[PDB]
Amino acid sequence: PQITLWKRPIVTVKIGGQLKEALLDTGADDTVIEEMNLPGKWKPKMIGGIGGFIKVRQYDQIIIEIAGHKAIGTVLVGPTPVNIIGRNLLTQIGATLNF
């Protein structure tokens, strides 16, 4: 599909058995999902955005479907204001920026 940027590029994703809305974000190295009680082992991480760093839990090998496209990779879980799909997963669904 093609997504214009007149509005936030938000699509439905499936993760951990739940559907969520998430922002397709070329400016994000990582994928950051709002607090959810995901199963399994995780690793402490801190990630930096415009205003500073936040603490998140790093889950690896997480299955995530993005707008119908299956992917698997690292998902960070923590107190983010918005669900963010980052380049680590955007590459897996073959996304590009075009102009």
Binding site for ligand DR7 (CB under 6 A): 25, 27-30, 32, 47-50, 81-82, 84, 86
DSSP category for residue 50: T
Residues that bind its own copies (CB under 8 A): 1-6, 8-9, 23-29, 32, 47-54, 67, 69, 80-81, 84, 87, 90-91, 93-99
Nearest CA to 57 out of 87, 86, 80 is that of 80
User: Which residues sit opposite 76 in a β-bridge?
Assistant: 32, 58
Taking the least distance from each CB to ligand DR7, the nearer of 16 and 58 is: 58
Q: What is the DSSP letter of 65?
A: E
- Residue in the block written with tokens 């920026």: 97
6 interacts with, out of ligand DR7, its own copies, none, CB within 5 to 8 A per kind: its own copies
